[PDB]
Amino acid sequence: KTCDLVGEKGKESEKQLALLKRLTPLFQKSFESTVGQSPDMYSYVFRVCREAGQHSSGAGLVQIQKSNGKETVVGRFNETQIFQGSNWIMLIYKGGDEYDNHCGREQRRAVVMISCNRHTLADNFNPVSEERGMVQDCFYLFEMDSSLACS
Amino acid sequence: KTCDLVSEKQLALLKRLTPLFQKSFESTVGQSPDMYSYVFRVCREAGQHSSGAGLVQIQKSNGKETVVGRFNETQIFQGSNWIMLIYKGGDEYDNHCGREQRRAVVMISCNRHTLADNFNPVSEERGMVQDCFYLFEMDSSLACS
Ligand SMILES: *[C@@H]1O[C@H](CO)[C@@H](O[C@@H]2O[C@H](CO)[C@@H](O[C@@H]3O[C@H](CO[C@H]4O[C@H](CO)[C@@H](O)[C@H](O)[C@@H]4O)[C@@H](O)[C@H](O)[C@@H]3O)[C@H](O)[C@H]2NC(C)=O)[C@H](O)[C@H]1NC(C)=O
Ligand SMILES: *[C@@H]1O[C@H](CO)[C@@H](O[C@@H]2O[C@H](CO)[C@@H](O)[C@H](O)[C@H]2NC(C)=O)[C@H](O)[C@H]1NC(C)=O
Ligand SMILES: O=P(O)(O)OC[C@H]1O[C@@H](O)[C@@H](O)[C@@H](O)[C@@H]1O
Ligand SMILES: O=P(O)(O)OC[C@H]1O[C@@H](O)[C@@H](O)[C@@H](O)[C@@H]1O
């Protein structure tokens, strides 16, 4: 019912479990941000290791078309990767819904850069961009502030 | 002889990093036989073989050079107070990551006090079937909003 790590198990995997544990106070929260202009107005909902979608799909981050509440899963938390930088944490959710035309029809993916901010536990979640111009390895990029990424 | 993208916003971002082009950033890390020295440059040759390397990994034990990413294949994104620079096209792995080409992802965070400093490796994700990557960080006032 929480984040599941993907990758090789070992010393590094063990460190990533520790990072997820540190983010526990954020689990109960839900972050949202609406961007874009009609007919492409989108609302992104992001959560840390908890269901961010409306259909129990295991979504960690979803995209909702404002015009018509169509929900698209950007990434699932059962496919998480996480890394600790000096003043930030990079959180990745793979296994989102598949593209039909772009990116070799691969599953969508979310990359969230959580930067250190001593003033708040969590705030300023914002979509940065969607890299959908590659034949593979595409991603939706986001940012958010959190004191938990600080040294 | 400069970064080649795959976007007007991206070209503007590259332009913004111009003052870093002439610099060379180095950082040694790890413990032999796994001690590596990383050399990173923005849109300029970081290697010794004119291969177009934007970031190379040097094995300190024997001086062997491995290209992590080529500025021949650059992607760049701008967050509120950070810039993400990506160089794909590095040397291929022999065993990890389906033998794909190495890749470098550099998180350039805002720091009002320096034009560019604190370049360092953060981690190497080499446990995936594909889309592996070397993660780095560095500070720069140019990343500040
Ligand atoms: C960006 O610049 C890169 C460096 O200049 C480009 O890399 C080169 O890309 C070409 C075209 O895809 C590759 O050509 C292939 O070569 C292999 C043989 O590879 C092996 O032998 C060569 C020569 O001895 C050696 O350089 C390689 O490392 C391998 O040992 C052929 O079997 C294929 O048919 C094809 O000709 C080059 O191999 C590749 N060289 C490298 C890694 O620098 C890259 O394509 C450019 N990307 C762009 C256009 O954005
Ligand atoms: C993460 O969770 C998703 C959603 O449950 C898993 O995707 C399903 O995988 C099964 C088996 O491969 C398929 O039959 C379903 O059609 C998939 N549903 C989708 C794509 O939404 C996914 O396999 C999980 N990742 C893991 C644990 O490997
Ligand atoms: O699936 P295709 O046809 O390639 O379209 C892809 C696009 O779909 C839309 O519904 C949104 O989710 C966009 O962010 C996405 O880039
Ligand atoms: O080429 P293989 O055997 O897969 O080993 C991969 C490793 O090689 C070393 O020389 C370094 O470049 C490491 O960063 C890399 O992870």
Curated annotation (Swiss-Prot), chain B:
One of its GO terms (cellular component) is lysosomal membrane. Disulfide bonds join C3-C43, C97-C132, C110-C144. Glycans are attached at Q22, Q48, Q59, N72, Q78. It is a single-pass type I membrane protein. Residues 1-145 are lumenal. GO terms for molecular function: protein domain specific binding; retromer complex binding. It is found in: Lysosome membrane. Keywords: Disulfide bond, Glycoprotein, Lysosome, Membrane, Phosphoprotein, Receptor, Signal, Transmembrane, Transmembrane helix, Transport. Residues 1-145 form the MRH domain. Its main location: membrane. GO terms for biological process: lysosomal transport; protein targeting to lysosome; secretion of lysosomal enzymes. Transport of phosphorylated lysosomal enzymes from the Golgi complex and the cell surface to lysosomes. Lysosomal enzymes bearing phosphomannosyl residues bind specifically to mannose-6-phosphate receptors in the Golgi apparatus and the resulting receptor-ligand complex is transported to an acidic prelyosomal compartment where the low pH mediates the dissociation of the complex. This receptor has optimal binding in the presence of divalent cations. The extracellular domain is homologous to the repeating units (of approximately 147 AA) of the cation-independent mannose 6-phosphate receptor. Homodimer. Interacts with GGA1, GGA2 and GGA3. This is Cation-dependent mannose-6-phosphate receptor. It comes from Bos taurus. The lineage of its organism: Eukaryota, Metazoa, Chordata, Craniata, Vertebrata. The chain holds residues 32 to 182 of 279 of the full protein.
